[PDB]
């Protein structure tokens, strides 16, 4: 038998990559896609402009889209719903599902920042998921609204995490360089970046330096205390499709040498024997000296590992280094899946 | 003024910008086109793979290519001498043009860091000129070695410059996104940059980091004495054909807000009302939240302009900040042709 789950903004840029996760899953039966009203009614395959490189899962295809609406007969028997939906469109549903005993696990940034919301990355803050005990108090729901970060955001923190545990962390400086997927089909147009890059993502920076202090944060007497350290974000949008690529400089408390910095992201890896279907190792190294590359790299773990090269000694601060993710897997679907996995497992 | 020109290199990536400038310029006549042999006897047409996006200047199209020897006829009335060769060429012509009594204004990175070598931004400290009279004495020969810097090099210390001058510098972060134009036409493989993109570029941070602080030196005893900032980069290539974008994060030594870093670089005008025709503004300021744009804002001063946008307050420095340059118009070919127009309206 599986958990049945559902999807929440199942035609559009992350909802694609939930399918695509969820169509054949030893835990999870993708028994619900819901969408807007023109695509309610409608086969999948004619209701998404798929833009994946690989087809539609077959099982999926044929499967009609219902309307956003907790009550409806095809949400009756589903456990679990994943959410794709934009941030205004979220703060409206995702409390609806809950109230209905449904467990959220959502990429949308509307709760992302309440104080009894967690916002999770299974390998960095699983012990924040404890915040789900407060939150069905204080809202009175008996669901669960659980969220993944912003996909900047995922891929410095997780980087960040093991440096942080062994070193400390004063100062993180990064530069992003990012795909155009997560901005959804009709998101970032083709002159923006043909022969062009945009040296500005709304609200990606203040994500990237608020979101982090949380993720990284302590769980003291039912709030998450906020991490003290320093970080300055510059995002940038290039022309990539998938993979979002960060140079990252980072001051630690204790002082590293590249080596040692090196060998705490190998040794990383929290989730290794909990039998997570959607398991990757964290950060895999590169050793070669222009890796990782998006195209090349953004596969490494089915999408779900970060990929860091170029660990070098930063003449100001302790280190510098590229990191890669998946932005619309690890960053995205993959994070909200990943999350639901550990979920069920760990917690109720 | 019909003052005769040559070029080195003249069919490659930068010779063809060098071209493009001194073919109609009020100053310099370009009588000679040096390249190599497979090239020498051929009409520049047909030597030179043109792959600009204006057509070749029509008075050059027939011009016959020359060997790149400093005893040719076509050099003989010739004593301004542009360079558009590769380090390793550079090491052996340059030398060999000194000592025919030419002064080379050269891109090569060969004679940059040799401390009988000005390294000069003429906006930035044109000073440095003067260490041609210690060349000549170290040296033997009646020429001249005069260099530009690396493009990147450029595009942040015009920036850095104003900002030092008033504020003083204590440590810069970049980040670069590089265009491939400056590796050639047969540099940068569109396999590396289609839905991809580098993590690296051979020598450059090396470059940024020692460069910069030759050029914000001060000149004393005849040598220059080192900037004394600490300056750590991180090296890109993207998908983009002219235009280097960088992400600046910048700690002053008095402290400066925003509006005071953005008056300093608005005010920034040295060279202004001395008819040189290759001027333009050296910074100018965009307060649109997502510029500069390389295909929007490289043309800007007819790529002598350095373009900066975004300027706003640094949650660990002072400011950040992003800067644009035409990597092959102010970080190359007009950086020399900028070099030797000061050098005959101002030196001698
Ligand atoms: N584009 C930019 O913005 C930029 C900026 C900074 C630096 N650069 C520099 O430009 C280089 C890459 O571009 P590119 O396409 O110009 O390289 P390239 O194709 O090697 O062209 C440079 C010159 O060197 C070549 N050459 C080979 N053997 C020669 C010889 N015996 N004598 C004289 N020239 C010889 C070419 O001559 P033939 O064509 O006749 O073979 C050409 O004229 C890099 O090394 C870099 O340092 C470019
Ligand atoms: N993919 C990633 O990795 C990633 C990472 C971070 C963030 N994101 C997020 O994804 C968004 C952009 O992607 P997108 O193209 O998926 O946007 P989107 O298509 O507008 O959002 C997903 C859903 O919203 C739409 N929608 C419009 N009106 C609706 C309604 N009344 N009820 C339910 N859905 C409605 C679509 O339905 P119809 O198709 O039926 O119109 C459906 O695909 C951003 O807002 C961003 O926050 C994605």
Redesign the interface.
């Known amino acids: 038998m599986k958990i049945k789950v559902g999807v929440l903004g199942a035609t559009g840029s992350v909802g694609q990559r939930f399918v695509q996760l969820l169509a054949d899953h030893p835990m999870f039966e993708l028994t619900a896609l819901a969408a807007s009203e023109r695509s309610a009614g409608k086969k999948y395959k004619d209701a998404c402009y798929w833009f994946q490189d690989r087809d539609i899962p077959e099982n999926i295809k044929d499967m009609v889209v219902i309307p956003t609406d907790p009550k409806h007969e095809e949400f009756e028997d589903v456990d679990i719903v994943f959410s794709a939906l934009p941030s205004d469109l979220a703060k409206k549903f995702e409390p609806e599902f809950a109230k209905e005993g449904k467990l959220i696990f959502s990429n949308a940034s509307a709760y992302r920042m309440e104080e009894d919301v967690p916002l999770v990355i299974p390998e960095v803050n699983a012990d924040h998921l404890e915040l789900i005990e407060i939150q069905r108090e204080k809202r009175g729901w008996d669901g669960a609204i659980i969220t993944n970060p912003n996909c900047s955001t995922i891929c410095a923190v997780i980087t960040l995490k093991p440096i942080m545990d062994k070193f400390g962390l004063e100062?993180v400086?990064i530069?992003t360089?990012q795909a155009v997927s997560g901005a959804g089909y009709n998101g970032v147009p083709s002159m923006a970046?043909?022969?062009?890059?945009?040296?500005?993502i709304?609200n990606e920076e203040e994500k990237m330096?608020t979101e982090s202090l949380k993720l990284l944060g302590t769980l003291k007497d039912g709030k998450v205390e906020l991490a003290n350290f320093?970080?300055?974000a510059?995002c940038?949008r290039?022309?990539?499709?998938?993979g979002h690529?960060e140079?990252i400089?980072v001051k630690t408390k204790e002082g590293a040498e590249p080596e040692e910095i090196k060998e705490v992201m190998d040794k990383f890896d929290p989730l290794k024997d909990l039998n997570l279907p959607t398991y990757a190792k964290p950060i895999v190294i590169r050793e070669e000296?222009?890796?990782?590359?998006?195209?090349?790299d953004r596969n490494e773990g089915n999408g779900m590992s970060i990929v860091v090269?170029?660990i070098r000694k930063?003449?100001?601060?302790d280190v510098?280094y590229?990191a890669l993710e998946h932005n619309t897997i690890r960053g995205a679907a993959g994070a909200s899946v990943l999350n639901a996995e550990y979920f069920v497992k760990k917690y109720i």
């Open positions: 100062a400086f530069a360089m970046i043909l022969d062009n890059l945009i040296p500005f709304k330096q320093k970080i300055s510059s940038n290039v022309a990539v499709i998938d690529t140079s400089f000296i222009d890796r990782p590359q998006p195209r090349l090269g170029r930063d003449p100001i601060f510098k590229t």
